Amino acid sequence: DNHVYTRAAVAADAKQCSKIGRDALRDGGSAVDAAIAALLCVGLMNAHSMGIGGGLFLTIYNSTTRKAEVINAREVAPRLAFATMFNSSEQSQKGGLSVAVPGEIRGYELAHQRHGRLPWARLFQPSIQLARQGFPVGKGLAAALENKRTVIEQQPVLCEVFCRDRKVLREGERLTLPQLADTYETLAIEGAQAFYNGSLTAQIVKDIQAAGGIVTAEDLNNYRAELIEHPLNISLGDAVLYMPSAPLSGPVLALILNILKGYNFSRESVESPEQKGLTYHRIVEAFRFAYAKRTLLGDPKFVDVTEVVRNMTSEFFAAQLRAQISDDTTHPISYYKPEFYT
Amino acid sequence: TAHLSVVAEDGSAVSATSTINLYFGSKVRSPVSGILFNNEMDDFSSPSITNEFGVPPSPANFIQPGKQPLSSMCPTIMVGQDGQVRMVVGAAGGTQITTATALAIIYNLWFGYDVKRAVEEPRLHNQLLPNVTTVERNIDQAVTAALETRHHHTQIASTFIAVVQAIVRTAGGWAAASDSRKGGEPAGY
């Protein structure tokens, strides 16, 4: 194919999951039903990347209302977490202590409640099948599996599904995920509540704590996905761009693009090496200015960022930064005024 | 992290980025449920841990009970003045997510590359600290030259920079692209 479609499209990082999203659309699902169905699949085929143990953000545009919204379903620190809980990168990267409270399923549930057209169980059906039947390991997972071969091969509970004859699966080899298949089935029939306050909850807590974690039933009971009715936007010519604000990187993206829009890039900007080189230099300098301000961002419910974010989405502020970009040189770090306090 | 982009027949759209953080997250798999648990606690700044030489921790992103860690994710939907979706785009890949999402938008919207080219086009990344411009292997080497004569210190990404999924409205309908760097493929009707 060339991947131009008349009516609808799903772009995922595994073919089988794009197809599962497409079939859901074909069966009368909204864009959300499709997204959820495809995401459930990606949690299987790209198990290294994402899944129901993690968290997500959805940016959603409704063509009827012409309104855009964001669903924040990112993990949160457990109630017993504290600033000085880790003393090495090792401690914050491996084991139960490194685990934040998963928001994935609550996020799916809120998105489905607001925009779903298919039954909840229907979104899980093809992934339940896929996880039992198995699938060839794709390019992405294969390379992840190789990158982490040591840690995986020496952890029996991971080797159980990710090894063949005690060696990580290679590209093309069959991966089955039978336990997840059952878990997905429970979720399909009992609903979101099975994870957060239901039949899966005690076992989740037990697994996390047995690995040294501090997530408790209360953490799960209290998790809430959040509807953000007014996401970040910027104006770009005749278009508006909707993206999430802090704690995500919409503000950084907005700043990068507002800086660069003052240069009026076009086809001509990459036509000759003289133009092309200047264009890419300007792009990198915009990255640098945008990342300088990034260090003041954090969860806006805990840190006051309204001013910082206002600056990062302001065109005038962007113009001020653009004017400090030198066409003939990059600069030392201090030149961009990174800030670590206010 | 994984990004997904969706446009339905009625013209509604979803841009979705989801993550367990590092490859296989915390490395804690439940033997009973099969759930792989995230290590998203690692996205917080810590006063004890020094990540990069000369880089102080960010107090705005310290751990508090109930707090969400800073993320590089930025799932994005661009909508035309007429209320029709023009672009659904996002990326996976650490701090490279934001710059790669910027690049794909720049490539399509301003340079005029079709969605597939916009996704496949070589990328580069700089995040101020560390103090280095990372370029993909097959970048136009005139770009490399233009950066180095301008005193950038460049280095070549040993693998690749980010993973972008995107959909763009065209005359023909919806053009879709999945990043060959990870091996995805789109689908539609």
Ligand SMILES: N[C@@H](CCC(=O)N[C@@H](CS)C(=O)NCC(=O)O)C(=O)O
């Ligand atoms: N948790 C981070 C993102 C973590 C992330 O993207 N990790 C890597 C793996 S270390 C990844 O997905 N890289 C792109 C890929 O190789 O798929 C955030 O929210 O900003």
Ligand SMILES: *[C@@H]1O[C@H](CO)[C@@H](O)[C@H](O)[C@H]1NC(C)=O
């Ligand atoms: C790190 O040190 C602090 C302060 O001494 C302590 O409270 C905390 O338990 C330690 N964390 C780990 C994971 O060892």
Ligand SMILES: *[C@@H]1O[C@H](CO)[C@@H](O)[C@H](O)[C@H]1NC(C)=O
């Ligand atoms: C758009 O809004 C309508 C009416 O407010 C709502 O019922 C529906 O869920 C939304 N449609 C889509 C496709 O998301």
Ligand SMILES: *[C@@H]1O[C@H](CO)[C@@H](O)[C@H](O)[C@H]1NC(C)=O
């Ligand atoms: C952009 O966000 C601000 C605050 O909500 C406001 O100016 C406006 O409503 C938004 N623009 C669009 C097109 O939604």
Ligand SMILES: *[C@@H]1O[C@H](CO)[C@@H](O)[C@H](O)[C@H]1NC(C)=O
């Ligand atoms: C926002 O930008 C203005 C200059 O445009 C600056 O004076 C002010 O300090 C900035 N505010 C913050 C919180 O950085």
Ligand SMILES: *[C@@H]1O[C@H](CO)[C@@H](O)[C@H](O)[C@H]1NC(C)=O
């Ligand atoms: C950072 O990099 C640029 C060139 O790569 C250079 O001007 C500068 O000396 C470097 N160091 C600092 C501390 O900014």
Ligand SMILES: [Cl-]
């Ligand atoms: Cl499993």
Ligand SMILES: [Cl-]
């Ligand atoms: Cl991805």
Ligand code: NA
């Ligand atoms: Na394509």
